[PDB]
């Protein structure tokens, strides 16, 4: 590995504080810096005693003859040239980890940490963890506001029980304001001090990762705050991370945006993807905010944005554009997707992909991207897309609740159907509810349905679909309250002691994810493991089958499709007469192996007396039975 | 007067902290709460100590028998119905005592203490403003930055400071537009007394003090906080009515009577206990439209059908309905009219408790004529609006080069038939932050606005800039850097000192000029304009009479303005119709080497005298210029 | 409205029955007056005989049976207000229909659409005053013709009403459903509701009011 390589894949191995028992080096990027002074305790903080030494590229280096490993250090950063002389502490980009102190009056103090790589020490910092998959997104503080370490043996006891594959960990980076949730970072390598230090954070990773558990973390990747004190703008005495003008703002989260055009800053974040999978474990990233980051008109607030003089746009950027999905005509504004893309994110997102399948393979991406106009942005690099393992189902849930709120006598079963039946080219995180649907006073999805019971169902449904479903922390207990950062998950409503209710919910989940890890046919993500299985619009059920493997409906022989689930829901939330007729690939003894009006979830009813792991005989390639209200049920053949 | 219109009309001096020389009474609302403990350090801050009484009406009292005055004190507040309990301050704090966990408390405050000199003088709203953002300005005390806003605004002339949100804030850099506490003045600067002292200071300088009060929502956080006060949402509305997701701020429910009291209160105690001359009311259009400054949220189109009579009379007689083509529905489906009749009843009570005090409305959105207009008249009763928009149009109209732009389209944005008082803000601290392009830079030099500030001051309304402006910064605003003081003093850059004196002189002019008092556009009359020659004319009416006289006397403080928007030195010969067939005299000429330095064009003394050609003024513009006319003697 | 009957027909606004055995008044329904001068106005306009029950008169909500009385307090100059409109209103509409020979004739015939505007909500209809339709442009012939405007748009829009009628000349206003005789001091009515108007050509161009029902004739 040449040092440019090192530079370009593992730019964290160059630049930074790099210690060994004899010496620490320390090297930081400022091109257009006059002078680099190291501040470090050991010199009581003089912000001259230490002179730094630009090379040729525009990098201050200098090697201090001790071990400071653990010790503390900033830059003192100058710029006095003629274009207000700059002159300022600065913490080091590459920090793993920031001291936060309060001064006399108030004042925040950010130094840099000199890290040791080496001091924790792994059984499993990578584990062979495929992508079934289930994902429970959670807040560190709301979860347990403590040491990752006790948050880290929370998150195993709950999810041991709860069954999901992977937690979504909501932006764990430094930040100055708790209140932005974490997506207003600092320094972008450095770990949340909070909740204690970057090595309590690997144990984390580690106790996650000895107990069969990934780690997806969230990546703002697109912005950082404004603070000069704690992160990166103006870090020379010029835009050195950040575009200039109104193009270095994101007037929707008050946020710098990255100059992505620029060889150091596209290496610094797509570095940053690397160390995540190499230096902390971490199984993926999911980025936030993609759709400002590849548009400018679209949550980017309120600015005078640029139209593209689209003669400017070489061949490669057409290339990637139409192999998305190409143009789309806004006729309401009266221009075109075309004129409205940044090529540059949208080409920087392709690389980000590129680079990570040499320097990460393994390492998985879910795309957070709410505008939807691109088919194919969640799909391979070579296959036209920006490389996104996943895509999110942002709007999905908003569509289907309308769908539910209309009285069952005045909607068509087939509108449903067709937003099951999507032909996504991209694999998809269901998410059920995120931290944003259940905050700032929205309601929440149990409370809209307005007892548990069509919880139990419509759970059922997102696990039985293509894709990895996802819920947010309180949702395994059908909680009702919102989501801020005033308070956390109420412990009391999980275990045997919580209130029926909460119980019955969880339960479902445990047993769905029983399902999603063991089932074959529930492994695949792509909608073609889906086909349509017949509806009835007027007794409103309709059904789907999930191929256990590469044989459909050619064949008819036992062997091929012993792993088929046969998934069938009645959407009539009241008992009349609902007889279903339900085709089936062979002719044999099909078993329910999930059904949701179990008294298990849903307590002792009139229309459940009876087991309902019940077994039955096709008449042909059909099954009849009798469906009770809101039954989802699924179905394999008996051995 | 009754405690009932004190409990109404001046609630700070029933709720809070009241201490006598024996006893200590505190009182807080708190309908929904189980119990409510006086937390104080006196007795080493136990939560259980002393509980307090609730009366009938939801407020927990009690007495200490002890003069508390300076000593620090919470509320721990509990709620056990169908499990809250927390230390909370007090909603009427003057002030928070602060101390990597924050620890805020209220203090016992003596509204007797500052020894007042100049509380009210009577300083009229002729009126420029000078809007500053305190800790950019001078990051020091109260005390300090009162001497420094006094010293620079001896030599700029502005007559009103206008202060960005002074109230307690945990986020420094949301520039104080998210308040913990809105009765408490930011501690960061020192005491409420240290805050009285820089009105009082100003004050005696013949300085006005107007301060941004975001009236419309609090911050969402609890330990500084309104929200979720007795376990309940006391101050804010419920659900999603209740978030603004544009600022992730907590909107109050000013449909409770004890909250609209404590919000207009607030405004009646910047007056009279703090001295303050006005408040510029923030996020004016989110207060009034669902749809408008809120975000993304599910807001709900008002049934017109639902709309009650009385609404639809404010309505009507702020301007009426419009349909929205790009979004498909009319105004009235997305007025909040909660909102708008309470600014109303702000401004109605204001009448009584504080009949001197002006409001600003900083409102976006501009599509009801008469919102800055008196209550009886179908407006809101802000005194003034903002020129908000307007700005935007005028450098949209520079923008375009002469031969492509008709001299109309300036004259009808300037002849705008306005019913309201304007504050004409040339630039704001939101124009120029987050990578904007400032108005001198997007000039490309400083000699066109030499004259644009000029036809701003001369204009009807309350001219505006922002801290920078009076010396050409070309920066943004944001708080993490100050105002550059080296573009003053001794060592500044020529330019620098033009642009300042150009402000000393228009000020000047402002304070003492009759023709420049008034506000109201009806005392502008068009006075001529010449497409091709690029030129337009106005007179400013320096009493009551129009063109109906022709007497000296009735004409004495008139004032003649012409402007030239050719930059090519050529032919400009302007043909300007005035009132009175005598001499006039230039009192203000924008082509002043004391503005724009030596140029080929005004080697001649500025400030010349003509004779009229029976009614009219002939003589030749030069370059950008700029010029002002009185009746001479 | 346009039902081509063959039958001369009571139209009963409301019967004994309608009232009875706790079913809804029309007045509760329309959930307040405005609506029930306009809506009296239509039926006292369209060819036929109107009928209305004991109580109508004064908008009466209890329900018809032999255990109350008429409420004779709701009648006379001491009435509450609503109870004066509403009587007023149905004066004012009998004053017209005894005197305008447009309202003797309850042949459907005696009746024919003028036109109508869906996204506005207005339809009109003409009332023949003898035996000559659209044939003749003369005012001998259209002198006691009666142009009838339904606006049902309940709240203040946009509603410029083109209206076609038999002759070019002057109209007056004869009946004005938004008079404040009928519905009170309200924002849209702080005119005189008898306005004259010049047609411009064979049409009338105005302004449309919530609920407004308006009749006009030729004057003179």
């Given at each position: ?392 189902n942002?709007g999905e849930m908003h569509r289907i609740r309308s769908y539910l709120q209309i009285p069952i006598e005045h909607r068509l079963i087939e509108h449903i159907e067709i937003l099951i039946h999507n ?7 269901n998410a059920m509810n995120?931290?944003?649907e259940c905050?700032?006073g929205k309601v929440r999805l149990i409370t809209e349905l307005g007892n548990h019971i069509p919880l139990i169902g419509l759970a059922a449904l997102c696990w039985f679909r ?9 949702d395994?207990?059908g909680?009702e ?20 209710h909460?119980?019955q919910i969880?339960?479902n ?23 349509r299985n017949g509806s009835n619009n007027e007794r409103k059920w309709f059904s789907f ?22 998934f069938v829901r009645n959407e009539t939330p009241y008992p009349v007469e609902c007889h279903a007729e339900i ?12 059904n949701s009006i179990d008294?298990?979830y849903i307590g002792?009813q009139h229309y459940n ?16 039975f009798d469906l009770h209200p809101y039954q989802n049920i ?6």
């Open positions: 590995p040449s040092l440019e390589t090192i530079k370009q894949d593992y730019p964290y191995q160059y630049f930074g504080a790099h210690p060994n028992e004899t010496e620490t080096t320390f090297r930081v990027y400022a091109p257009r810096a006059t002078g680099v002074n190291l501040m470090r305790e050991g010199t009581g903080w003089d912000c001259f005693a230490e002179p730094m030494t630009k090379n040729e590229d525009g990098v201050w280096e200098i090697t201090i003859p001790e071990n400071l490993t653990w010790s503390e250090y900033k830059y003192y950063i100058e710029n006095s040239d003629d274009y207000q002389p700059y002159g300022m502490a600065r913490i080091d980009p590459f920090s793993p980890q920031l001291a936060v102190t309060w001064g006399n009056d108030g004042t925040r103090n950010f130094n840099s940490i000199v890290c040791d790589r080496n001091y924790f020490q792994w059984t499993h910092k990578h584990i062979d963890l495929p992508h079934p998959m289930s994902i429970y997104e959670m807040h560190l503080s709301t979860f347990h506001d403590g040491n990752y370490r006790d948050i880290a043996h929370k998150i195993v006891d709950h999810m041991s029980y709860m069954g999901f594959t992977h937690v979504q960990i909501m932006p764990p980076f430094q930040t100055p304001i708790h209140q932005s949730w974490g997506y207003l970072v600092g320094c972008p390598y450095a770990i949340y001090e909070r909740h204690g230090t970057v090595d309590d954070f690997k144990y984390l990773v580690n106790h996650c990762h000895a107990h069969g558990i990934g780690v997806i973390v969230d990546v703002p990747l697109g912005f950082g705050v404004q603070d000069w004190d704690c992160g990166l703008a103006n870090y020379d005495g010029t835009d050195l991370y950040h575009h200039s003008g109104s193009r270095g703002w994101n007037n929707q989260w008050n946020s710098r945006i990255y100059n992505v055009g620029d060889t150091y800053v596209k290496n610094y974040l797509i570095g940053l993807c690397t160390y995540l999978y190499h230096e902390l474990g971490i199984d993926g990233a999911r980025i936030d905010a993609v759709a400002s980051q590849i548009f400018f008109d679209y949550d980017r607030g309120f600015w005078d944005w640029p139209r593209n003089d689209r003669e400017q746009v070489e061949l490669e950027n057409w290339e990637l554009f139409n192999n998305l999905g190409g143009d789309r005509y806004f006729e309401e504004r009266g221009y075109w997707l075309s004129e409205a893309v940044d090529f540059a994110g949208l080409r920087f997102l392709r690389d980000l992909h590129a680079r990570l399948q040499h320097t990460a393979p393994k390492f998985i991406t879910i795309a957070e991207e709410s505008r939807r106009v691109f088919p194919k942005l969640a799909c391979p690099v070579d296959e036209g897309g920006l490389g996104f393992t996943y895509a999110q942002m032909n996504s080219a991209e694999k998809m995180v995120t931290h944003d905050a700032n293509p894709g990895a479903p996802m819920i947010f922390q309180g395994e207990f909680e309250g919102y989501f801020d950062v005033f308070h956390g998950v109420d412990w009391s409503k999980t275990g045997p002691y919580a209130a029926l909460q119980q969880s339960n989940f445990h047993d769905l994810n029983q399902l999603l890890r063991h089932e074959p046919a529930l492994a695949r993500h792509g909608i073609n493991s889906m086909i089958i999930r191929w256990g493997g590469d044989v459909g409906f050619e064949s008819s022989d036992p062997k091929d499709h012993k792993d088929d689930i046969i085709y089936v690939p062979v002719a044999a003894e099909y078993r329910v192996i999930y008294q298990r002792s007396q009876h087991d309902p792991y019940w077994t039955i005989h096709s008449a042909g390639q059909f099954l009849y699924a179905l394999k053949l008996k051995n």
